[PDB]
Design a protein around this motif. Sequence first.
Motif, short mmCIF file in Angstrom:
data_model
loop_
_atom_site.label_atom_id
_atom_site.label_comp_id
_atom_site.label_asym_id
_atom_site.label_seq_id
_atom_site.Cartn_x
_atom_site.Cartn_y
_atom_site.Cartn_z
N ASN A 274 0.69 -0.79 0.13
CA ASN A 274 -0.33 -0.05 -0.22
C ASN A 274 0.92 0.96 -0.22
O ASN A 274 2.06 0.84 -0.49
N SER B 14 2.80 -3.93 8.73
CA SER B 14 2.73 -2.65 8.93
C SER B 14 3.80 -1.57 8.48
O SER B 14 4.02 -2.28 10.09
N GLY C 49 2.28 3.01 12.36
CA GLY C 49 1.87 2.39 14.13
C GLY C 49 2.40 1.63 14.64
O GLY C 49 3.80 1.22 14.52
N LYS C 50 1.61 0.84 15.42
CA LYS C 50 2.44 0.00 16.61
C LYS C 50 2.27 -1.34 16.68
O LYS C 50 1.50 -1.85 16.63
N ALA C 51 3.19 -1.58 15.54
CA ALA C 51 3.47 -3.14 15.02
C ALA C 51 5.27 -2.76 14.51
O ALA C 51 5.12 -1.87 14.07
N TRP D 64 -3.45 -6.76 15.50
CA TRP D 64 -2.18 -6.46 16.39
C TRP D 64 -1.45 -7.58 17.08
O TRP D 64 -1.03 -6.36 18.15
N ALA E 147 -0.61 -5.26 20.21
CA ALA E 147 -1.29 -3.45 20.34
C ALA E 147 -2.61 -3.38 21.26
O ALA E 147 -2.75 -2.29 20.37
N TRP F 249 -10.26 -4.39 6.59
CA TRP F 249 -10.02 -3.59 5.19
C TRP F 249 -11.35 -4.57 4.69
O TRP F 249 -11.31 -5.83 4.19
N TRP G 188 -10.93 0.69 5.41
CA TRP G 188 -10.32 -0.12 6.41
C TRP G 188 -10.88 0.27 8.18
O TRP G 188 -11.00 2.15 7.62
N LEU H 274 -10.14 0.82 12.28
CA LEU H 274 -8.90 -0.05 13.59
C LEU H 274 -9.73 0.53 14.40
O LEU H 274 -9.33 1.75 14.90
N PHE I 271 -9.07 -0.33 18.90
CA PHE I 271 -8.27 -0.34 19.79
C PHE I 271 -9.09 -0.91 20.72
O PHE I 271 -10.07 -0.38 21.63
N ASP J 252 -7.09 2.37 2.10
CA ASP J 252 -5.44 2.50 1.64
C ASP J 252 -5.88 1.41 0.17
O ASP J 252 -7.12 1.08 -0.14
O1 LIG Z 1 -1.02 1.48 15.71
C1 LIG Z 1 -1.49 -0.12 16.00
C2 LIG Z 1 -1.98 -1.04 15.23
C3 LIG Z 1 -0.87 -1.46 13.55
C4 LIG Z 1 -2.41 -0.25 12.81
C5 LIG Z 1 -1.43 -0.10 11.43
C6 LIG Z 1 -3.01 0.31 10.38
S1 LIG Z 1 -3.55 -0.45 9.97
C7 LIG Z 1 -4.25 0.49 8.43
C8 LIG Z 1 -3.93 0.96 8.28
N1 LIG Z 1 -3.06 1.05 6.90
C9 LIG Z 1 -1.76 -0.14 6.83
O2 LIG Z 1 -1.33 -0.38 5.76
N2 LIG Z 1 -1.21 0.42 8.34
C10 LIG Z 1 -1.83 1.48 9.09
N3 LIG Z 1 -2.45 0.12 16.97
C11 LIG Z 1 -3.21 1.30 17.82
C12 LIG Z 1 -4.16 2.23 17.10
C13 LIG Z 1 -4.23 3.38 18.35
N4 LIG Z 1 -4.46 2.97 20.09
C14 LIG Z 1 -4.83 3.99 20.72
C15 LIG Z 1 -5.03 3.35 22.26
C16 LIG Z 1 -5.76 4.28 22.83
N5 LIG Z 1 -6.36 4.97 22.34
C17 LIG Z 1 -6.24 5.66 21.58
C18 LIG Z 1 -5.78 4.80 20.35
C19 LIG Z 1 -2.93 1.75 19.81
C20 LIG Z 1 -2.98 1.21 18.68
#
Ligand SMILES: O=C(CCCC[C@@H]1SC[C@@H]2NC(=O)N[C@@H]21)NC1CCN(c2ccncc2)CC1
Lengths: 124, 122, 122, 124
Positions: free
Chosen positions: C9, C31, C34-36, C65, C72, C78, C94, C96, C98, C114
């Motif tokens: 993507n 990914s 993000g938290k990945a 995740w 995460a 998606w 998509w 997402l 949490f 994406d």
């Molecule tokens: O980042 C990730 C996981 C990876 C996501 C990657 C994303 S998937 C759609 C997009 N397309 C990709 O290819 N990549 C991105 N998860 C977080 C989200 C935010 N989180 C919080 C927690 C509490 N309050 C607010 C926010 C914590 C967990």
Amino acid sequence: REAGITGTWYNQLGSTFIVTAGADGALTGTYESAAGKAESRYVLTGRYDSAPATDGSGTALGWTVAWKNNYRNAHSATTWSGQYVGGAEARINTQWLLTFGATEANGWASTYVGHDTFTKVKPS
Amino acid sequence: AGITGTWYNQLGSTFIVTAGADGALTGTYESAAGKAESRYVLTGRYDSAPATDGSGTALGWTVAWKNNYRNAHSATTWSGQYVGGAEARINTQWLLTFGATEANGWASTYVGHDTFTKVKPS
Amino acid sequence: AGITGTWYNQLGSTFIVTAGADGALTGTYESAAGKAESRYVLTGRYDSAPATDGSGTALGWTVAWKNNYRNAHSATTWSGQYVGGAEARINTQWLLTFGATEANGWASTYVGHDTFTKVKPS
Amino acid sequence: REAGITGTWYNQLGSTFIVTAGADGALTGTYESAAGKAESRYVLTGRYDSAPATDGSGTALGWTVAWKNNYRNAHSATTWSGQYVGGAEARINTQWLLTFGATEANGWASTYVGHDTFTKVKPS
Ligand SMILES: O=C(CCCC[C@@H]1SC[C@@H]2NC(=O)N[C@@H]21)NC1CCN(c2ccncc2)CC1
Ligand SMILES: O=C(CCCC[C@@H]1SC[C@@H]2NC(=O)N[C@@H]21)NC1CCN(c2ccncc2)CC1
Ligand SMILES: O=C(CCCC[C@@H]1SC[C@@H]2NC(=O)N[C@@H]21)NC1CCN(c2ccncc2)CC1
Ligand SMILES: O=C(CCCC[C@@H]1SC[C@@H]2NC(=O)N[C@@H]21)NC1CCN(c2ccncc2)CC1
């Protein structure tokens, strides 16, 4: 900024977004869609953050078009939510929701979601 | 038109709106949730000549979360429809965008849904 | 079916997928944002007998995740379609979600989009 | 938990979501929609966080249904994204995206958005 947002913008569909960002946080103008059940210009109104952060973030904003004008009525409305990001290649990045009138039983299937990227130069 | 009045959603937020003859929505929004206090200006649009077949009245509005007291550098749009009858309702789905850098823009919009009725959630 | 292969993507994320005869999508997702970190299991479904009129092939998939290295406490779905041709693409939007308390649930889902192609974004 | 998620759930439309949460983070089962171009059961597959936080938050999850079974094919697919919240009145709170096949020119109008709340007891 007022100066950065006010003007004519184009999305990837070829639609034309004509907007004025007023000192009070108001967005006004007209929207001409290149797609869907629409012809000519429609009134829009919205809001923007008139005192955005100074940390490099974009300027949050949104606006609405109801798809009724002097020529036709498509019994529907779109809202765009997004932000203006200034600079060399200024953009308004948006997500949108298009709701069309429906009976209560069919309300679950009454809203499309999508995304439009607005730039100062027409694409393709 | 049914839309003009005071509405409340499931969070207890207060939507005070006037639907004008020109298709405009104007009024104030007070959120019971999030980075928000007191009232915020709203503006939007609605279908001022809806269908007569039982369909609802399409509409939308925007709040930018800046007022005299607070600025949360964000904006919400609500998209939905008014459904009249014994228990009138406005059913919406919303998008809340917060200011972000271009690099963090992928994670800059929340989605949700609010249902509004005229019953004060006392 | 065109879907099986490695896709990337606009963020540079890597989607390695197999479209099986039973309508299943299986594979891994990495990914770039993000938290990945590293690869995550994905599973989904696709229309294994699409229309022949030029329409795309509807599909969707999910990543939670959590992997051996990180959790995460979140999941993305998606939803979109494969469009074949000279430059095949998978266009998606998509959601997402949490983990959140019930009280903070109103602010628990991001929305985005994406677009995937087979060209390594070198 | 595995135990909390596995079983039969119902949404506000009267649809029936039958799911098993496996030890590997997998969701499998069947979905019977009470609405739209659908009859009988459809295969679903998804994922959930098999080691959720211990702070009171919900358990993140998602799943997909492609609307093809032995009886018909509606050239479409829905994904649900949300979380399981356990307790006295257990719930799975979701947002969904329903994409239907479209030509490239009409792709902008190819996805509905909505929301379903799943509970252990049928509504109304
Ligand atoms: O980042 C990730 C996981 C990876 C996501 C990657 C994303 S998937 C759609 C997009 N397309 C990709 O290819 N990549 C991105 N998860 C977080 C989200 C935010 N989180 C919080 C927690 C509490 N309050 C607010 C926010 C914590 C967990
Ligand atoms: O097409 C329009 C109005 C023009 C929308 C243009 C859209 S706004 C986001 C995107 N960005 C643009 O620049 N342009 C497009 N409205 C409909 C939609 C679907 N409608 C129904 C009715 C009954 N059942 C199902 C669907 C009927 C009326
Ligand atoms: O909370 C608000 C403003 C009030 C929103 C109230 C919402 S409107 C839809 C819903 N219906 C209501 O009636 N009420 C709620 N804005 C935050 C959002 C999250 N923000 C960030 C910033 C950086 N990273 C992540 C998140 C900071 C700004
Ligand atoms: O109706 C279904 C399949 C069943 C979906 C059931 C939905 S899933 C989210 C919600 N929660 C449930 O429990 N049930 C509903 N699929 C379509 C949709 C619209 N389609 C087109 C085609 C061309 N143009 C416009 C629209 C044709 C096929």
